[PDB]
Amino acid sequence: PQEYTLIKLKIHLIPEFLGSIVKGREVFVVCATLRPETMYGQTNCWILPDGEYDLVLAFDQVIPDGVLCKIFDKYEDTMKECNTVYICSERSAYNMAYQGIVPLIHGREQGVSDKLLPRIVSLGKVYGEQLIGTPLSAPMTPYSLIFILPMFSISMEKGTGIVTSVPSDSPDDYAALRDIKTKPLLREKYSIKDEWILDPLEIIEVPGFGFMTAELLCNQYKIQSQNDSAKLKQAKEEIYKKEFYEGILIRGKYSGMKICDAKELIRESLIKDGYALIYLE
Template sequence: EGVNPQEYTGIKIQILEWPAAAKLTLDKAAVDTEGKKISFIAATLRPETMYGQTCCFVSPNITYGLYEISPTEIYICTSRAAKNMSFQKITPVRGDAKLLAEIPGRELIGAKVHAPLSVYREVRVLPMDTILASKGTGVVTSVPSDSPDDYATVIELAKKADYYGIDKEWASLEPIPIITTPTYGDLTAVAIVKELKIQSPKDKELLTKAKEIAYKDAFYQGTMLIGAYIGEKVEIAKNKVKNDLIAAGDAFVYNE
């Protein structure tokens, strides 16, 4: 972990339908999901891009926990993140997060979820091998228009859908224009991935470079194309969208 504190926005991505494998595991653990709002918590630095969410990534190699937040709400994230949340007044008891069940990431793939603000009403949970268990919540929401990592991952998933055990359509939702910049146009991540000739999510060095370019370009030069703050600078709109998500109960601040 770095020395500098990082402020993330935790986005609540609500489960609409569990995959069969996950259902079995929850039954075995005797978790009562009836009438409860159960959400993946995705940690993002770019809340203003949430209009363009096309799927939600988990790592097939990470074990996630279901944590009780209230009698009617459950969060899904890594145990490390739940522990951190328990010291930030996010869980009901300080220093404690009540674990209801553990579930391997691979069993969550294919879940149908609702991503707040997304143009797409329902999206799927898909695998991302490059997620680190040591950062954020272990859940990454996918915005291929503005995140080079996300774009490279959905391209790879669509290309090798059978290998990843997913439906090709789940990874094939079109990137949505969210932000325009003078240098890269309306789909910054798509343009930069092409410019740097990035071939796969494993092109680590190029993706690090792409990430830096994309972030600076959007933050300093970007203007919103969608949502409540069309025409406003990203620098300004970022906090407004974040605050709106929080006010709607769809997000919270998460620090680490």
């Protein structure tokens, strides 16, 4: 029952097809991480192309034993406290509703019965593929626009089904990004443009590994595709732990600190500046 940082990546250019649905509201794509420290190295964002994601109305402010949420009679009642849209899985939007991050509204249950059934405010459904190439304004990374690209190893059953890419220090991200870089047939299939593919960033030094720890571990485990999920799971646990203790930040406000010393502060800052939320799951 764990504490995630939910990172907000703002859509920088709203696709035509979503302009009617969105209506001058700020839209953010949202992703859950355990490693806010790593957000200095975002190169892209990852989405499941066949995944179905909702455009979910959300509270502008959150109030961060157990937790509150709010219900309203109708869509029109929320427009006061809610001028914000999050793209995410329906599943994860329900979790956010039950922690007070999105509004609920009075729905009536299907069928013969009267029973009150709380619903989120979905403005529409969208497939991931329809968002590939979308520019996002990402917090902390010095590339400051980054793009949505496809990753086929994403589970819709976890987080929001949309994920951050730090190929410098995430084996999954290294692997999915290398699959894009080295498979021209795959680029052509998703109309991937060369300018959407940004290089890894040097952000975290680990004694004996340097600044591309994910690439070295992928090699050491012999990870050949983003689909090698036993090896990736294992390697993800290794890098996590290794970087927690031995990793040194070489970027941003807290450069020169060990990650175990800076992680909390970095996370506090993200929540305080509005770049992220706490999300339990």
